[PDB]
Structure 1
Amino acid sequence: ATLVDLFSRAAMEMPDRTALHIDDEKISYGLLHSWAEGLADLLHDAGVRKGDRVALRMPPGANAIAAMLGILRAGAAYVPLDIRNPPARNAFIVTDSQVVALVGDPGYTGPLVTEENVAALRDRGPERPGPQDVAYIIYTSGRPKGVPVRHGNVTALFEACSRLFSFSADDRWLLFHSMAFDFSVWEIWGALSTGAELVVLTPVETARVVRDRGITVLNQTPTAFGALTTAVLGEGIDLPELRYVVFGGEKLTPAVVRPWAKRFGLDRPHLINMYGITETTVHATFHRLTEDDLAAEDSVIGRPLPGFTHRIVTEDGRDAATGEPGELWLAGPQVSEGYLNRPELTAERFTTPPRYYHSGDLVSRRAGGDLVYQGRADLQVKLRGHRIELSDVEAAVRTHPAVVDAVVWVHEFAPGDSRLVCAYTAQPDARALRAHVKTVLPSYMQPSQYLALPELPRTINGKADRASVARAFDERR
């Protein structure tokens, strides 16, 4: 019912198994459970009561996971502040989430449990959260908003994934993502609710430990996976232990999957695409990739998870016919109650008797029931009497061999001067690229300007940060 209940079961029944594995160092379920229960006692002393929220700012590692379990155990919601947060953003989130304490290192004036404080309780009750209680509050961005996910939302996710995956205490999960990215929730509680192991951390170097630590459940975004596949193919690394690669973050194209699939096939490991949004607890669909998916260029996300009811809605509120694009609507136990302190948005994104969340994503239902991601509604744009699929522009640029990644957008140069711009990453001058794109796109879809970048700035979820790339562009033009 709760996540502290999930960790309870696993710690009680398998206390000798390795919970955390950091380098050559190991922490057992029983000791983690003991450490975390001590932390909760600490927090409660500091006045942390049930239903409060606590900021967590720590480098990934044992103290961070212990801190996090501590916070949950005290009955509180944890608010992760990513180390990559500039000071203004941290201050905003802490103020906006109304946190009553912080755990970690401040870069604030409230109650401070340091890291040192956390580290001490290792070698060393309060009331327990319920399913309606908030587990975490994660921020998506641009004005950043908080999504508060409840214990019932998260345990609903793992009950939903129950018979889709075959997980056991024998697995080894890698913790690869920031605790401010909710993909990390799935990583942490994938292992911790099954008795499994959680390995806590160059692509080459990352690839080395995936074999060396015998990772069986790997979670990646498409950008990270391409860099991983290049290192793996390059060194000749083999990963006999790997059972599942699971894909979150940006839309997955067959193109990033094909080289891997050439080397390893699709039988072992299983390649699984999961469409997800923060507002519906990490994951919302499941598709196991097949040779079919590599024959075409469609981004199949498969079928929504078992607890979900859904609709594909037209612009004027109807159910979309088959092959007809539409906005995906999602109802169910994984759907959050709404935003934090965004009563307006919550009003329009969540509507009620299923209560639906409006993804703002376009999808089509194939025959047989499979969903196919078409794109974001917000990225369908009107320019000079034309309607432009920014996503389609991004793909055409991407089809250049020397181009890794690309983001295109409408940029306001002057009050009457709005034009398409593209930023891209190489693995190639704009001239050669310009020449190629004239071949692929009609003139009204061709970017007016090209910006070569070392790497695209991305959100915490790893989706391309449009507001930042625009600002980067304005500054060097």
Structure 2
Amino acid sequence: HEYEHLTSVKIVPQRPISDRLQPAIATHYSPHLDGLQDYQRLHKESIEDPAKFFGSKATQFLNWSKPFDKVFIPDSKTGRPSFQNNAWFLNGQLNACYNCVDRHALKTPNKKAIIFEGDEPGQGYSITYKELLEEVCQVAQVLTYSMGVRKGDTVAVYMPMVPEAIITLLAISRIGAIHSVVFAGFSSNSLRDRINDGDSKVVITTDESNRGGKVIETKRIVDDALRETPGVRHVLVYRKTNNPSVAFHAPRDLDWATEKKKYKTYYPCTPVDSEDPLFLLYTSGSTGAPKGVQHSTAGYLLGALLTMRYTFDTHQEDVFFTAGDIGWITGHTYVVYGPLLYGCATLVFEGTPAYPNYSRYWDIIDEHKVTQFYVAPTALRLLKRAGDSYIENHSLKSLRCLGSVGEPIAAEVWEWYSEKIGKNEIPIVDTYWQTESGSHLVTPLAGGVTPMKPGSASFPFFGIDAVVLDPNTGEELNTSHAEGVLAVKAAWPSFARTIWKNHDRYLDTYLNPYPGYYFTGDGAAKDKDGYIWILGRVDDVVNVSGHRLSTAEIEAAIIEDPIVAECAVVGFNDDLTGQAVAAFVVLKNKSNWSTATDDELQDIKKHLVFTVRKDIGPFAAPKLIILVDDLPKTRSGKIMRRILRKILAGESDQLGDVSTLSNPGIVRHLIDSVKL
């Protein structure tokens, strides 16, 4: 029907796991939610009266310096939380660092907090909670006395993900300062914009870093960016490499590893209001200017805990491995403010599975008994191409939960992941969320809570009353079958509060369209039995005369016929009503790809169009099939479809800064392939 292909799948029930438990929890393990029926009644309560649901969890899991008086500010027209004046846990005080480190370090001092593995396989080490406390405290004093940082100021971090970066972020929070984290691979122009927009005065960096065996000159990029910035007074530099030929200017270059020794190993937390900003994330869609999405402390922290507890069903005895950069929202939520806050160990991996040979993730998982593995789908596709030969010698038995985020997962990939890594026993949690939500919006819950469909997030996370709206106007869609856009009826605790120094952009972007609801920006469909499918961003919908076209559905069709490794569907200007469908297809093996073109590539194209035509339909079937070696990908884990769209359209020059991509250089080929 309208997505009949996409949604016509079998429901997979979750099987109990007991035989993958480690001795640590084997004697007491029990899921936090017993079944779907508890989800259903608890969810109901969360929506109907947040005052009690969040009200209680807020004090049971967070350690407050001062109790709060009000759970939330209500909407005058209804008892639900207001979007425009969203605020929670009013008048209480809470220090995020206290809850993340001291709370545990002072009780369970000899428990691993951080497990670190470097780019080169022979290096790594662990840090216990006691040790973390001491490091955080010394850094906080450095910031306080030498860098001159005061409550409410801003500290920019441009570090690679290393233990020192984690420590730094915690130390900043400890003194009531706001942190802002910029992906280490960004160029100096975008760095400069972020530094200036957020008004930082202190920049924390490294001299050089290594990722995938390649050297990244982090100091030089910072020095460049700061040439046009009047703000910054001090730069703190961590000499990860002890002897590089990197300039160092004593007037404002402080050696992280030399300054630290001058400070005491215990230093107190500064009280912070529950609504004070915790951090900013300068996200970007390469339009306008980077948006300093702002999240407050109590809100964000509660969100992160509830998610760890109910989505991933974690325990204090686990190891949570998040395969992603610290500058991304998942870095914050699941590397630093997730497991540490909860009390689980975090596995930190600075490199890429590419180096030295694709078996790296697996080797990591077994060596450290990783129990949770949360990975971007792009990584999964690359691993899948590498082939099953890279997992022949791994049992991966310790894993108890798999999941992914950042882009729709085709059922084809989901099935591979389930069969080869999860061994048909471990549930795969496909979670849907946005930087601005700060936490999961729609997701399967682990344990035995919900049946799963391959390829579909399932039900709204507690407290979020998601609805599919008529895409054009007015009313929602109250029906057994709905196609529209996803939106939320009321605010929740970790909803981004604003955009740094631009509240108008915030309102116009998210709350003014379809007023009354939070506009997600993504398309969606509500299935029979309530599963919510994500159809792709609204902005990328290709309009064909016959019907709206879901990029998620067509891409899912194209990946069948296992000659295809990857694919992106792009609308393209044509003489047709609306737009033509074009597709960028990556073939699995180069040898098949490089052959006499008339001889065989022509049939590959016939097969690809044939499949879409029969399973999705004639309007969808692509006309332009471009067979390429790869697709542009972002650091954040997504195919950068906007680039493909511009190149395909013909405006291949104005792509903005290529250094948003994880594979810059690729554009050279993309342009040639499109032209011919």
Q: For the pair shown, which has the larger CA radius of gyration, 1 or 2?
A: 2
2:324 to 170, 177, 180: 177
Q: Which amino acid is 1:9 matched to?
A: R
What amino acid does structure 2 have at the position aligned with 1:459? Answer: T
Deviations 1:426-464 (Å, cap 9, x if unpaired)? 214653332123322355534443444433222332121
For residue 461 of structure 1, give the secondary structure of its aligned residue in structure 2: coil
Is residue 198 of structure 2 the alignment partner of residue 97 of structure 1? yes
The alignment status of 1:129 with 2:277, answered yes or no, reads no
In 1, are the aligned partners of 2:546 and 2:619 still within 8 Å (CA)? no
Partner Cα separation in structure 2 for residue 179 and residue 141 of structure 1? 18
Write the distance in 2 (CA, Å) between the matches of 1:327 and 1:231. Answer: 38
Greater RCO, 1 or 2 (C-alpha within 8 Å, sep 6+): 2
TM norm structure 1: 0.88
Q: Which residues in structure 2 correspond to 1:68-467 (within 5 Å)?
A: 68-105=169-206, 106=219, 107=221, 108=226, 110=232, 111-116=234-239, 117-120=255-258, 125=268, 127-138=270-281, 139-143=283-287, 144-161=290-307, 162-188=309-335, 189-201=337-349, 202=354, 203-228=358-383, 230-231=387-388, 234-263=391-420, 268-288=425-445, 293=452, 299-314=455-470, 315-321=472-478, 322-330=480-488, 331-351=491-511, 356-382=517-543, 387-411=548-572, 419-427=580-588, 428=593, 431-439=602-610, 440-441=612-613, 442=617, 444-467=619-642
The residue type paired with residue 326 of structure 1 is: G
Question: Which residue in the other structure is 2:132 paired with?
Answer: 32
Judged with a 3 Å threshold, the aligned counterparts in structure 2 of structure 1 residues 118 and 447 are, in CA distance, closer, same or farther, namely: farther
The range that moved more, 385-394 or 100-109, is: 385-394
Question: What is the aligned-residue identity percentage?
Answer: 19
**AA of the residue aligned to 2:237:** T
- CA distances 1:289-320 after superposition (whole Å, capped 9, x unpaired): 899756xx6x3211222132333221312121
The CA distance in 1 between the partners of 2:618 and 2:528, in whole Å, is 34
Pick closer, same or farther for the CA change 1:387–1:307 going to 2, 3 Å: closer
| Segment drifting more, 445-454 vs 214-223 | 445-454
What amino acid maps onto 1:95 in structure 2?
N
| Contact map agreement 2:172 2:178 (CA 8 A) in 1 | yes
Secondary structure of the residue aligned to 1:278 is: coil
Report the counterpart of residue 105 of structure 2 in structure 1.
11
TM-score (norm 2): 0.64
Q: Distance in 1 between matches of 2:348 and 2:260?
A: 17
**Matches of 1:459 and 1:320 in 2, distance apart?**
34
Return 5+ residue gaps in structure 1 as ranges: none
> Please, what is the CA RMSD of the aligned residues?
3.1
Whether the 8 Å CA contact 1:156–1:334 is kept in 2: the answer is: yes
Against the structure 1 CA distance between its residues 197 and 122, is the aligned structure 2 distance closer, same or farther, given a 3 Å change threshold?
A: farther
Greater mean alpha carbon deviation, residues 401-410 or residues 210-219: 401-410
Q: In 1, Cα distance between the equivalents of 2:126 and 2:189?
A: 36
Bigger strand fraction: 1
Query: 1:53-68 maps to which residues of 2 (within 5 A)?
Result: 53-68=154-169
Distance 1:59 1:375, change over 3 A: closer
Q: How many residues align?
A: 472
CA distance in 1, matches of 2:424, 2:543: 43
Amino acid at match of 1:436: H
Amino acid paired to 1:197? A
State the 1:155 CA deviation: 1.5
CA 1:151–1:231: 2 relative to 1, 3 Å: farther
Q: By how many angstroms is 1:220 displaced? A: 0.9
